[PDB]
Design a protein around this ligand. Structure first.
Ligand SMILES: CCC(=O)N1CCC[C@@H](NS(C)(=O)=O)C1
Ligand SMILES: CCC(=O)N1CCC[C@@H](NS(C)(=O)=O)C1
Lengths: 265, 262
């Protein structure tokens, strides 16, 4: 991979691997979400980040995900090359936004697209805070000045409010605990694992007869290595829509809430 | 990746990814085990293969044993070149070996070996392969032996005992998710390595590096099954492992790990 000519976005090509595909012999949405994380990490590395600045490291501040939104038109098959282009943009003092465009390396067509909202937070106290001016100036030079949105549409599904699932849930998957493969280099549960846990309560029949088109997922609380998650799903509907809820199997503390959209194969 | 000049082995280079490394910023043993599966898949695809003729008789190649020895784990961003090849183990089964190297220095940073047996996909009955099938794949194997672990009296061929109750350490209630399944909906052989290492104490992981792992495969775990992971120290640090069904206690896996101080 490498930064584009203007140095305001990053491109990388990925060959789809054998262990990365599902029952349809195409890449899973978790493989796609992993590739977005990977291309986003290399974009930060290419412009000197580790994605903390010198002021963020000084004040013990980190970037955390608040929302993830992914919309797939075609899942790359095993062996196919997929080119992902990523870039960042400031959302004022709310935080940053990172967008992605997935393309076919042979045809050049857009086969998917993603967007995510990141927030500023003290790494120790877990207290969210607004982006200060001194931090904002350190990264604004790596972002396009004119808006560049992957989801620009007047009424897009990436900005809608997600409601809280009411008990009893139509479907559920109970007793989900993360393993060392679910943790990252800093021992925190990878954001991709939550997508896998959300989709564990989707019935097998829906998976076997439908393809996942959209997934919007709001991140409320981080799950610890020693925590246990409960995954809840309810149908809210040609197409199939679902409401999702991840919560601690004990107290019932909410960690995630989301929505999925599926279409007939 | 591509087949070597003689077409009797396959080479492929992999760049280590951000989500593939552990706490020490080097690739995990499960990432390594995934890369071996990937390079082995592409070697079969490069010579047209899953296998041939045995498709009508309903026969599949299944793992009986996996043995991996790592000297250095590639860091995040480092390129690692893996060379794989197959060989006939008479009529007991087939064997696949791997050599992991540093793309910059060219030194061997790890090596693996595995024994594959052949069974009916439906009845799951282990059986030796016919001479008609033991000829269709020999043209893709070196005729003279080429072993990754040649040493007389080595770790890859030793008998693994069964762990006695009570186990020193355990991790219970381990269920596979859709990410743990492959294209055919079976739990991929790499997940068992992750489950085996779940009963290793966190202190051992934080203060040691995994040097060797020998794992014998006895029974496949279904999507709706629950696994119990058991571990006992048998001593560097050596361990005895046992995966079994949460209910009846049916053995699915048994193994041994060896760890060195960082
Ligand atoms: C290429 C890296 C970059 O421009 N940035 C911009 C500011 C946020 C960081 N990115 S993030 C955590 O994905 O929002 C670093
Ligand atoms: C390049 C492919 C190849 O040589 N073979 C030989 C027979 C066993 C198969 N390999 S396997 C399943 O990994 O044991 C396919």
């Amino acid at each position: 991979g490498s930064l584009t000519e203007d140095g305001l976005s990053y491109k990388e090509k990925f060959v789809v691997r054998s262990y990365e595909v599902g029952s349809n012999k195409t890449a899973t949405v978790e493989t796609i979400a992993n590739l977005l994380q990977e291309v986003g990490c290399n974009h930060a590395q290419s412009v000197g980040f580790s994605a903390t600045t010198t002021t963020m490291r000084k004040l013990h501040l980190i970037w955390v995900t608040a929302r993830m939104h992914i919309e797939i038109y075609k899942y790359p098959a095993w062996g196919d090359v997929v080119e992902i282009e990523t870039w960042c943009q400031s959302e004022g003092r709310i935080g940053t936004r990172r967008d992605w465009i997935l393309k076919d390396s042979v045809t050049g067509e857009v086969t998917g697209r993603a967007t995510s909202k990141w927030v500023m937070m003290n790494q120790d106290t877990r207290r969210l805070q607004k982006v200060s001016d001194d931090v904002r100036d350190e990264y604004l030079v790596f972002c396009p000045q004119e808006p560049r949105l992957a989801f620009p549409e007047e009424n897009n599904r990436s900005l809608k409010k997600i409601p809280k699932l009411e008990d009893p849930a139509q479907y559920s998957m109970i007793g989900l605990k993360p393993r060392r493969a679910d943790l990252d280099m800093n021992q925190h549960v990878n954001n991709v694992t939550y997508i896998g846990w959300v989709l564990e309560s989707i019935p097998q029949e829906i998976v076997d007869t439908h393809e996942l088109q959209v997934i919007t997922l709001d991140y409320r609380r981080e799950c610890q290595q020693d925590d246990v998650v409960d995954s809840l799903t309810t149908t809210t509907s040609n197409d199939s829509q679902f409401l999702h809820l991840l919560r601690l199997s004990g107290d019932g503390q909410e960690i995630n809430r989301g929505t999925t959209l599926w279409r007939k194969k």
